[PDB]
């Protein structure tokens, strides 16, 4: 079982074709998902459409958006925490907006009974003409005190169709109507002796500081949700240090419980992809004066002596955080980069230009600059390429795709909807992590000849090559690997492209 995870969606309030196609995509993304790393968006959903899969969702790290729904009930019954790592509209971790219909009734049921803490952000309710009993829910326990002012919740439902809360219910604050759908106070009912949350009002019934929403006892394992970091069933403020402080130590206090830091959890060993620092953490890139070396085949931060190579950030991160694709404005910063500390996107908008971003068109010849790069720490996405060129000339010297960051959290290499006849990625020797997708390239041929398994390093990697030019069509056009290389395939028609 472990924890089932979904990447989430960041499409804001954008429709995905028809309503049914949108609902389909939603159910693919959030089927069986116990923990959402990203943003949970429930938008453009229609009445009498099954939404029961949402019962499985326990956590949402980003924000929860619920909008443009004609549905009667959305069943986030087991959702218990909203970490608030990402805000919607820069100040709302939970947003329920404009849930109306041609008929007066819109959204009426939101039974988030287990919801107890929103670590960061505020809540906004607007244009909801059918919501029931969410008005009674008091948000002092749920929302952080610092973000309370930013809350802008206003309910507009005079239907009176909603029922009343149960007598066993604290201050009449209920989520829906049953006794199970009521406020659970773990913050306000606490004594002055508790720090943070509490299981009961008595001093003996307090929660540990790292217990997040609630606890069943004053123990780290009894924490229902982890606040900061997680070790086994325990929740901790920090991953246990490999070396800890001691009052008097003949040698460094090596901790038998010391574990490496990876994301929200603490693992025993960092993956081969990430930089294992001496402090004990899985890091994506070395900082200042530190560059990447392999001591025993694992990456580490060695201090540069004086001058040090430039850390060329990828598109979508750093200075180019909101940049959709490489374009004329940002292509100059990649002049002499031998490595891409990030992920590289290429989209058709770059060649046409975008007035909304005030972006000029991109020159095809300028792309040749990318020939200097040999290692991409993140992922490569190619949705556009110059029409005159028949191969990915710029990435001919690319060697290793580390795949530390992947598109949609899955694909490290993507080449879709290109007219190129051959890939031409001759120098590519290792795809350390992430899947590969080659689809919709009408004139591309030499893809299935290559054995992508030898390129794959991490176990479980898969390849998906479809909708390219057919093998029969390419064979009839003489577009098959050169005779000088019988096995292992090739990257193009000429002998230079043969694999070894």
């Amino acid at each position: 079982e472990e924890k089932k995870v979904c990447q989430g969606t960041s499409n804001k309030l954008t429709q995905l074709g028809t309503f049914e196609d949108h609902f389909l995509s939603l159910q693919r993304m959030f089927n069986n998902c116990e923990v959402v790393l990203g943003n949970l968006e429930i938008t453009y959903v229609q009445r009498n459409y099954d939404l029961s899969f949402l019962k499985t969702i326990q956590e949402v790290a980003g924000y929860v958006l619920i909008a443009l729904n004609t549905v009667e009930r959305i069943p986030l019954e087991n959702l218990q925490i909203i970490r608030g790592n990402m805000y919607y509209e820069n100040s709302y971790a939970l947003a329920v907006l404009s849930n109306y219909d041609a008929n007066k009734t819109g959204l009426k049921e939101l039974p988030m009974r287990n919801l107890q803490e929103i670590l960061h952000g505020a809540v906004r309710f607007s244009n909801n003409p059918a919501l029931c009993n969410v008005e009674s829910i008091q948000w002092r326990d749920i929302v952080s005190s610092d973000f309370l002012s930013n809350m802008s919740m206003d309910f507009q439902n005079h239907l009176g169709s909603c029922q009343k809360c149960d007598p066993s219910c604290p201050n009449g604050s209920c989520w829906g109507a049953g006794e199970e759908n009521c406020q659970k106070l773990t913050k306000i009912i606490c004594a002055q002796q508790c720090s943070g949350r509490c299981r009961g009002k008595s001093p003996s019934d307090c929660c540990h500081n790292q217990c997040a929403a609630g606890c069943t006892g004053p123990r780290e394992s009894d924490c229902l949700v982890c606040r900061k970091f997680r070790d086994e069933a325990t929740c901790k403020d920090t991953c246990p240090p490999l070396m800890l402080y001691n009052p008097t130590t003949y040698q460094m206090d090596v901790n038998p419980e010391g574990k490496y830091s990876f994301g929200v959890t603490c693992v025993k060993k960092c993956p081969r992809n990430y930089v294992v620092t001496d402090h004990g953490s899985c890091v994506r890139a070395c900082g200042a004066d530190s560059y990447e070396m392999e001591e025993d085949g694992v990456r580490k931060c060695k201090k540069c002596e004086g001058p040090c190579r430039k850390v060329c950030n990828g598109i979508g991160i750093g200075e180019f955080k909101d940049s959709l694709s490489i374009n004329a404005t940002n292509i100059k910063h990649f002049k002499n980069c031998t490595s891409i500390s990030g992920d590289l996107h290429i989209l058709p908008v770059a060649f046409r230009g975008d007035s909304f971003t005030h972006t000029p068109p991109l020159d095809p010849q300028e792309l040749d600059i990318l020939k200097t790069v040999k290692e991409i720490t993140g992922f490569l996405l190619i949705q556009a390429w110059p029409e005159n060129r028949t191969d990915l000339h710029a990435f001919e010297n690319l060697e290793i795709i580390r795949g530390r960051t992947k598109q949609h959290g899955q694909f490290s290499l993507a080449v879709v909807s290109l007219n190129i006849t051959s890939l031409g990625l001759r120098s590519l020797k290792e795809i350390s992590d992430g899947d590969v997708i080659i689809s919709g390239n009408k004139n591309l041929c030499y893809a299935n000849t290559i054995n992508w398994k030898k390129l794959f390093g991490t176990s479980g990697q898969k390849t998906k090559i479809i909708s390219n030019r057919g093998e029969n069509s390419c064979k009839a056009t003489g577009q098959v690997c050169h005779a000088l290389c019988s096995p292992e395939g090739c990257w193009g028609p000429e002998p230079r492209d043969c694999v070894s």
Binding site: L13, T14, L324, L347, L381, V416, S439
Partner: protein
């Protein structure tokens, strides 16, 4: 009506779709062509 036709100034905003106006939010968003994801439908949703 929830959806309104965007003004012609929002012409190329939707890379793979058509601009739509949400009157309650008073904002411009996209109707994506099938298979495309993102606010501006910028990235192709990669099938498994």
């Amino acid at each position: 009506v929830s959806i309104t036709k965007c003004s012609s100034d929002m012409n190329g905003y939707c890379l793979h779709g058509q601009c739509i106006y949400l009157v309650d939010m008073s904002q411009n968003y996209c109707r994506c062509e099938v298979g495309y994801t993102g606010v501006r439908c910028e990235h192709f949703f990669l099938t498994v």
